[PDB]
Amino acid sequence: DRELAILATAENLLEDRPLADISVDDLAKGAGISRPTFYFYFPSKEAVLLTLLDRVVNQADMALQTLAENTDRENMWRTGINVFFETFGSHKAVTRAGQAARATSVEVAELWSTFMQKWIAYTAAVIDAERDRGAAPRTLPAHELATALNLMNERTLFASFAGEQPSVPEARVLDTLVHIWVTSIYGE
Amino acid sequence: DRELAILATAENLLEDRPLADISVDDLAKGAGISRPTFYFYFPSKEAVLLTLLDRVVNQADMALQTLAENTDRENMWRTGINVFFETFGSHKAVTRAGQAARATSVEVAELWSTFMQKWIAYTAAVIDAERDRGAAPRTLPAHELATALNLMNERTLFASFAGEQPSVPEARVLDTLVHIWVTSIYGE
Ligand SMILES: COc1cccc(OCC(=O)Nc2ccc(-c3nc4ccccc4s3)cc2)c1
Ligand SMILES: COc1cccc(OCC(=O)Nc2ccc(-c3nc4ccccc4s3)cc2)c1
Ligand SMILES: [N+]
Ligand SMILES: [N+]
To answer: Running DSSP on this structure, what letter comes out for residue A43?
Structure first.
């Protein structure tokens, strides 16, 4: 919880500016500790972002697990995509920074990669179940369809949350993604 | 065409390694010229990448214009998405580097942004035409559906071309994207 202070301060500062405009001394100051005391909890400012990102991706992941262990088909996909929209949506600054650091950082890249593989494998399993019960047609291989849908969400939510041009406005992005998932999963 | 030599050399070196592992002296050497002679044609190695990216995006754009000024609906979308797949697919190293430099470079960011807005506006116009002729249903706003489909293609092609994990294998990515465009455009 000097640790938690450092994490909270880094998330607050990331609202204002990028990681590379945040100094260790910045983080230390905000957390009420000295610089060498900072280095006791974290090896670097990049390690702090990694930890923040790790907690955010694990929060989406635990929320999706919760949903899984339990409405119409459209509403089912909408409630699952909404886990990602609300979770990353509630941590935009960390989302944007972890987005950027995937270039910068092999560790940020592998964390992102492991969780995307997990969410894709879970989307493919649900598509397969829908196909085994006769509710969805056997069109594309489920895992390939899942990979594209998941990558679409990653890129489109990142764009909306960053205010990119072009982007879907944040107020319309959930409905946009759900329409594309549902038509592509159930459509022939 | 000392200019063209510098452009060709930079595209060849980008096959081996990132821009930040390529030196001006590298580019100059490959192009058969001195360093100050290099600085006569380009202000920096970043300006060379910008130019390479500019020619690649304009090539996709002119190819899509060609198609536009002229088969079943599935095949129509497939031939248009294929412009992007073949054009960026034929220039992977430049594609990957321009992908990365969007973070690094406001100019790379604006070039990418201008062309994505243009391709989205064109996809929305064709969707609207399909809806005006009664061939597609009026579901999502055409421009929002176009923005998500185009962002999906950008992210999914970049992943396939980079060999990312996760990605759709390059041999399956065109069919994957076309299925999602067609079901989402024509589906209710
Ligand atoms: C920055 O934004 C990002 C970054 C990375 C991923 C992302 O979206 C993934 C996603 O929405 N995938 C997804 C959505 C829903 C489901 C599921 N929803 C349900 C609902 C009921 C039962 C099983 C499931 S499985 C699975 C994966 C968004
Ligand atoms: C690195 O990979 C990238 C990077 C950026 C964009 C991208 O894909 C955009 C795309 O496929 N959009 C697209 C596809 C097709 C069409 C069209 N296809 C036809 C076909 C006939 C008539 C009109 C049209 S309009 C419009 C936009 C791929
Ligand atoms: N949100
Ligand atoms: N290609």
So the answer is: S
Nearest Cα residue to A158 out of B54, B43, B158, B81: B158
Amino acid at A48: V
* Ligand 1 centroid from CA A120, angstroms: 8
Stated as kind and residue range, the H or E segment containing B21 is none
Handedness of CA A99, A102, A104, A107 (dihedral sign): positive
User: Are B184 and A188 in contact (CB < 8 Å)?
Assistant: no
Domain boundaries, chain B: 1-44, 45-188
Q: What homologous superfamily does CATH list for A1-44?
A: Homeodomain-like (1.10.10.60)
Block residue for tokens 């081996």: B16
Residues contacting B30, CB < 8 A, separation 6+? B5, B6, B9, B10, B12, B13
One-letter amino acid for residue B70 of the chain: N
Q: How many of the other CB atoms lie within 10 Å of CB of B13?
A: 21
Specify the experimental method.
Answer: X-ray
* Cross-chain Cβ contact A166/B176 below 8 Å: no
Taking CA atoms only, the protein residue closest to ligand 2 atom 26 is B123
The fold for domain B45-188 equals Tetracycline Repressor; domain 2 (1.10.357)
Q: Which of A96, A117, A144, A167 is the best residue to mutate to test the B interface, defined by the most B CB atoms within 10 Å of its own CB?
A: A144
Q: In whole angstroms, what is the distance from residue B40 CA to residue B79 CA?
A: 41
